[PDB]
Amino acid sequence: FKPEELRQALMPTLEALYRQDPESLPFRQPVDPQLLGIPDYFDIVKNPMDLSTIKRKLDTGQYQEPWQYVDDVWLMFNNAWLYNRKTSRVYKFCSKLAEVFEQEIDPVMQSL
Ligand SMILES: CO[C@H]1CC[C@H](n2c([C@@H]3CCCC(=O)N3c3ccc(F)c(F)c3)nc3cc(-c4c(C)noc4C)ccc32)CC1
């Protein structure tokens, strides 16, 4: 896969996530535990991930294969479901994005 081919193919799946508003808002920048006053965040989440990081990796051609992109998107979701309680808005927004991602990534992976 050329990185331009991955970027062209996968960027619309990422755009679909950013289009979810307000559901994407907590995911658009890395969690900042100082600002949010949650010093245990990095005790629980050892490999942080967010949309800005994924976007940067796509933009710069850091993914060799599409599964690596998919793995990072799932890492972001898994981190949020891990840290946050299921009653929280952030966990529910995570679930909403995951549903959108599933629906958009499926045909794309098949094309590829
Ligand atoms: C610049 O705007 C942002 C919106 C999300 C704000 N925020 C908020 C704020 C705190 C105030 C209460 C509140 O409702 N927030 C909030 C704000 C907007 C949302 F869309 C949302 F779901 C939640 N909580 C966040 C939680 C997380 C989070 C993620 C993702 N994974 O683990 C943790 C913890 C990330 C961001 C959170 C921080 C400022």
Curated annotation (Swiss-Prot):
Methylation of the KIX domain by CARM1 blocks association with CREB. This results in the blockade of CREB signaling, and in activation of apoptotic response. Sumoylation negatively regulates transcriptional activity via the recruitment of DAAX. Residues 1-108 form the Bromo domain. Residues 78-96 are annotated as: Interaction with ASF1A. Changing S95I: Impairs interaction with ASF1A. Residues 40-86 are annotated as: Interaction with histone. It is found in: Cytoplasm; Nucleus. Changing E99R: Abolishes interaction with ASF1A. This is CREB-binding protein. The chain holds residues 1085 to 1196 of 2442 of the full protein. It comes from Homo sapiens (Human).
